Paper text:
A well-studied carbonic anhydrase II was selected for rational design as it has efficient CO2 hydration activity and could be heterologously expressed in Escherichia coli. Thus, to better understand the key factors controlling halophilicity in enzymes and to develop a halotolerant biocatalyst for hypersaline conditions, we undertook rational enzyme design by selecting just one of several mechanisms present in halophilic enzymes: increasing the incidence of acidic residues on the enzyme surface. Herein, we describe for the first time the successful redesign of a mesohalophile enzyme to an extremely halotolerant orthologue, that is, one that is active at 3 M NaCl and above, by altering 18 surface residues. In contrast to suggestions that large differences in accessible solvent area, non-polar surface area or absence of large hydrophobic amino acids are the important features that allow halophilic enzymes to function optimally in high-salt environments, we have found that increasing the number and distribution of surface acidic groups alone is sufficient to impart this characteristic.
Residue numbers in the entry: 4 to 260
């Protein structure tokens, strides 16, 4: 089973998921001086006022905050997109020290962590159907820059002791995903993939230019999670980031430039 260890990690995923070596894989490094403007791009609309969080779950690879996506309660529109994309869950990637852990990088700079807000196009009826299509998924990436402690983030981290091990979940109502956004929604966008197997090439990436904050102490809490289930030897979730992949024949575009 794939993971982030020496034998089963990113370098090896290509063996069981050869699309790892595909034409539109994520993440990438964003070489900012190679970014194009495009007047067709719009401001991002993150319509999250009605969001209804459900629960938090350790899936053996990260933890997800899942949302009720049965109707348009927390949706993503505009930016580079056409149509409505519903928020299904968010999750994070991090590393084993503060100097690394983001999946996307900006002129080779790694941040301590990265938030992924995963959305699917209503045209496809549900997440699994949408994940098979080039315009099916849209993921908003937000960097966590080590600095000040973040109170909104701490509400998530306060629940982590309840989901230490794979398979555990905890109820998690009333969490406003907009509370994990920077004040400015400037972004980069490119066509890419999910960053975990099966690495499907169905994602319009929207990476926000401005990070949100996290403290060094807060980063410790991520790394208390376990990849293993309860009763198995403790495999700490010290790092769960895929490194930057080659951009190949794609163009990153930026809004407002
Ligand atoms: Zn992710």
């Amino acid at each position: 089973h794939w993971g982030y260890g020496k034998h089963n990690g990113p370098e090896h995923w290509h063996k069981d998921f050869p699309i790892a070596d595909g034409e539109r894989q994520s993440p990438v490094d964003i070489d900012t001086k190679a970014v194009d403007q495009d007047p067709a791009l719009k401001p991002l609309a993150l319509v999250y006022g009605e969001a209804t969080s459900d629960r938090m779950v350790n899936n053996g690879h990260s933890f997800n905050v899942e949302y009720d996506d049965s109707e348009d309660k927390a949706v993503l529109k505009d930016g580079p997109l056409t149509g409505t994309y519903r928020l299904v869950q968010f999750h994070f990637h991090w590393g084993s020290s503060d100097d690394q852990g983001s999946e996307h990088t900006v002129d080779r700079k790694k941040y301590a962590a990265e938030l992924h807000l995963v959305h699917w196009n209503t045209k496809y009826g549900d997440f699994g159907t949408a994940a098979q299509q080039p315009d099916g998924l849209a993921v908003v990436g937000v960097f966590l820059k080590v600095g000040d402690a973040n109170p909104a983030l701490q509400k998530v981290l306060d629940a982590l002791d309840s989901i230490k091990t794979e398979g555990k979940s905890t109820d998690f109502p009333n969490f406003d995903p907009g509370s994990l956004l920077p004040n400015v929604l400037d972004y980069w966008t490119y066509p890419g993939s999910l960053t975990t197997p099966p690495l499907l090439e169905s994602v319009t990436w929207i990476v926000l230019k401005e990070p949100i904050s996290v403290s060094s102490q807060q980063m410790l809490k991520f790394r208390t999670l376990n990849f293993n289930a309860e009763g198995e030897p403790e495999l700490l979730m010290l790092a769960n980031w895929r490194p930057a992949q080659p951009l190949k024949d794609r163009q990153v575009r930026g809004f407002p430039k």
